[PDB]
C-alpha cells in the first residue's frame, strides 16, 4: 500500500500525499478482494479443518479405546465409525494420513499392516 | 474444565502415590480440600466434580478394578 500510493501521488505529481488518492489506494486492493467474492492453507487446515481434524480423531480413538475397556482401537474400526459419523467427509486416506500424524506426533502410539492399533498419546 | 482437571489431576496423583476404596479418595483428598474450602458451595463442587471425575474414570478409561467384591 505504501510504494503502490507513492506511485499515485508520483503521478500527477505530487510530492506529498494528499491523504486522499489512499483511498483508491486501498480500493485496488480490495479488487483482488473483490475479485476474490464469487493463508487459506491453515485456515482449511483447523478444526473443522486439520484441527477439527485430529480432535475427532483423537476424541474417537479415546472413544474406542474407552468402550474397547481401554483396549486397542483397529484401524478398521477406526475408518469405520470415522467415515460412519459421516459428515464432514473423513477419506480413509486423509484418516490414514492424520492418524500418521498423531502418532509420529506421539499424540498417538499405534502399529500393524491392516492392525491399527491404538494409541498413547504422550504428546 | 480442563485447568479444574489438571489440578484435581494433581490432587488426585498426589494423594495416589501418597496413600500408595474410591471412597477413600474422595475423603481424604475433600478432607485435605476442606482446608481450601472457600465456601460450602465449593466444597459441595469440589466433592460433585471428585465424584463425576471417578464416575469418569471408572465409567471410562482410567482404573483398574482386581476383584468386584472389593472392586
Known amino acids: 500500500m505504501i510504494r503502490l500510493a507513492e506511485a499515485h501521488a508520483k503521478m500527477k505529481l505530487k510530492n506529498v500525499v494528499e491523504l486522499e488518492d489512499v483511498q483508491e489506494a486501498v480500493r485496488l486492493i480490495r479488487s483482488a478482494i473483490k475479485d476474490y467474492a464469487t493463508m487459506n492453507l491453515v485456515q482449511t487446515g483447523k478444526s473443522v479443518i486439520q484441527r477439527k481434524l485430529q480432535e475427532d480423531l483423537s476424541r474417537e480413538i479415546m472413544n474406542v479405546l474407552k468402550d474397547q475397556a481401554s483396549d486397542s482401537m483397529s484401524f478398521n474400526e477406526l475408518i469405520k465409525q470415522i467415515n460412519e459419523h459421516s459428515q464432514d467427509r473423513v477419506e480413509s486416506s486423509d484418516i490414514q494420513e492424520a492418524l500418521s500424524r498423531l502418532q509420529q506426533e506421539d499424540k498417538v502410539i499405534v502399529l500393524g499392516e491392516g492392525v491399527r492399533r491404538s494409541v498413547r498419546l504422550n504428546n | ?71
Do not use: P
Request: proline share 0%; hydrophobic share 45%; charged share 35%.
Open chain 2, 1 to 71: 474444565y480442563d485447568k479444574y482437571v489438571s489440578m484435581m489431576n494433581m490432587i488426585v496423583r498426589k494423594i495416589a502415590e501418597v496413600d500408595r476404596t474410591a471412597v477413600d479418595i474422595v475423603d481424604w483428598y475433600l478432607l485435605q480440600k476442606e482446608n481450601d474450602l472457600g465456601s460450602l458451595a465449593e466444597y459441595w463442587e469440589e466433592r460433585r466434580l471428585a465424584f463425576k471425575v471417578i464416575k469418569r474414570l471408572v465409567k471410562d478409561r482410567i482404573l483398574m478394578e482386581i476383584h468386584g467384591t472389593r472392586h
